[PDB]
Symmetry: D2
Subunit: 210 residues, 4 copies
């Protein structure tokens, strides 16, 4: 059996020198685990450009499953996102100075898109391996929600066979040295991400525990 799984992580931004989402997905590049064969691409933390880079990664890799990963500084758990919202509302500018306020991602697109990943199943499997996980119901209104909405929009309109979604991850310890915030080690985050890609490759559907 073989499902091709595209993982994306973002580049560094807003002060930081490392984006853990890219550090964790980069080491899974080329991994084969169960049915999953994993490839990893980096997306810029830039509005509009991130979506162009993702469309290119879909053309080049022809994936069956796409999991985009971003950092959510301050959370304590790996959180798969249930909902992408059609809004760009930037509190801070992106890496190229764009700061959209009140802007639609898709003019006339739906208000929201649900995730296509079996996220409750992913949460229970990550937890079986001893690492904290929970589903989140807001992915923010910055570049991470932008890429999630843009991904689901592309799937619905042009690649309906693809199962796609977004997972937010904590800070790693090295990033909370001058500011106390929760974190999870990079080893637990890359392990959780591998479990997510394999669970999404094996399972079509989700379980009803909530």
């Amino acid at each position: 059996m073989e499902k091709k799984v595209l993982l994306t992580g973002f580049d560094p931004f807003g002060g930081e020198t490392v984006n853990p989402s890219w550090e964790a997905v980069k080491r899974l590049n080329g991994a084969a685990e169960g049915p999953a064969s994993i490839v990893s691409e980096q997306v810029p933390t830039v509005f509009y450009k991130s979506l162009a880079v993702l469309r290119e990664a879909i053309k080049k890799h022809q994936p069956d499953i796409i999991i985009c990963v971003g950092q959510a500084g301050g959370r304590m758990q790996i959180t798969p996102e249930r909902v992408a919202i059609n809004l760009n509302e930037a509190r801070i500018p992106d890496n190229e100075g764009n700061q959209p306020v009140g802007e639609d991602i898709s003019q006339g697109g739906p208000a929201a898109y649900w995730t296509g990943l079996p996220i409750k199943r992913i949460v229970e499997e990550i937890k079986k391996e001893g690492i904290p996980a929970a589903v989140s119901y807001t992915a923010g209104t910055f570049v991470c929600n932008h890429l999630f909405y843009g991904l689901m929009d592309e799937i619905s309109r042009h690649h309906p066979h693809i199962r796609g979604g977004f997972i937010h991850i904590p800070y790693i310890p090295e990033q909370t040295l001058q500011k106390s915030a929760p974190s999870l080690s990079l080893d637990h985050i890359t392990k959780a991400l591998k479990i997510a890609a394999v669970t999404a490759a094996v399972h079509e559907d989700d379980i009803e525990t909530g």
Copy 2:
């Protein structure tokens, strides 16, 4: 232009014999402030029945503006909600024992509805009076989001002239006596609610700030 503004607050939800959302909106019943003439109705913290009670309050009062209020224990600010989600996913049972998991509120309805209130404007006005306010992007998946989504569905399909939305409020101090959690006094919360009703009755368009 006098605008009738319907305000609702939930009945005590198993945990106390008082619900602050009701206590606050009940004292604004009959208040007239600027163009706003305010009426208040209580809604049960029960899935499906809450919506039936709301439909009845809409028929009886014929409101121009509807602001539904509920309690969000743990928050620190008055938070107007930007997005209602088509999902009933109950961690705990409602007042009559219903605990829906993974259920659509409207089968075939949109995934989400945006608020119809000028919420950025409301946030800035509450803050001008010295009380903390912020827009929130998830209203949960319990009876409070249920009523919010049901409200906006009713408006979209049957009462397109009505401006409607949802505002979550914190605990009052009396509720954090055995469990430390943030709170706002009931006098600040009812004041914030009266400012929201007046701001919504005086302006159809929102500010762009965030």
Copy 3:
């Protein structure tokens, strides 16, 4: 039966415009409640000078009870302090630029002083009136702990008949407008402070609970 209660509050620091500890104790100046007769003085948020101002307030008013109040931004409850510590360790400079690091308050003084107030009784009485309260075991190492330690030192060495202590209070709502943080209204804080002064004037002895 009449006890003179001296309350003090600090002026503002950091970048705030009101120090709620002064705003609250100022409105209790001249209040008589039960046995207590209350007078209020303001102390500067300056190391070493705060202590000189307090010594002067003790000479002038000849109090039976002294309760020094300061703001603890970020807490959620009124917190009477159990322990003062012999250390000035300033993360930020005070209002006149002093920033002591690793400095003894009293060279050769004890490492700590316990409060002289019936703080468990005070906590239970404030909570009986519906406002959250709890004892704290660190008052920090800035000017608020400095005044507390210096107060207890003054009492132990020169005024052993006086009952003295420190009470930290939260932000008021008006201070959490740009930064979300917990707060208590100024009406709840001044009412908690009047209850603390009256409870301390009526009982020399504390209850034993937590």
Copy 4:
């Protein structure tokens, strides 16, 4: 020159079968790193008995440096403690049912004891290795503070040559699976602890920071 460092950790408490402070120090037993030669002993989470077990470990091992470790569920950083307080005030009963309230540890002992470890130095060295650390000024009033005060009392009165202190550690991920709380991995915590032992074995002098 070799310094024998004794580390302690506690036994299981509260429905758990493993205690991280003990899991982390147990794997350092017999380690030699720089000048430090480390031995580890387990202490019961029992008032009064913990102190007797510690006195026995001091007699048997004759250590130059003692670092007692306990878990502080909820914190986000490794926190060396600056102050031990002379008070047993138990919110919950210990492993054998003792629940002291308002009790002195040493009748007539000082109100507090300062740590004997170079804790600022320890904090900067742990952070150099990418793991979060900060000094704490309250170690609670349960069995962890009890052992810290009792240790410093023993040192002051009978073993003035020993350098001793206490370090609180976070939850590990496995413990925050049903309750979301911050954690650090057991590998990061045991690495922090070995760095603490070696920094204390090499430096009697502490540094001056903020």
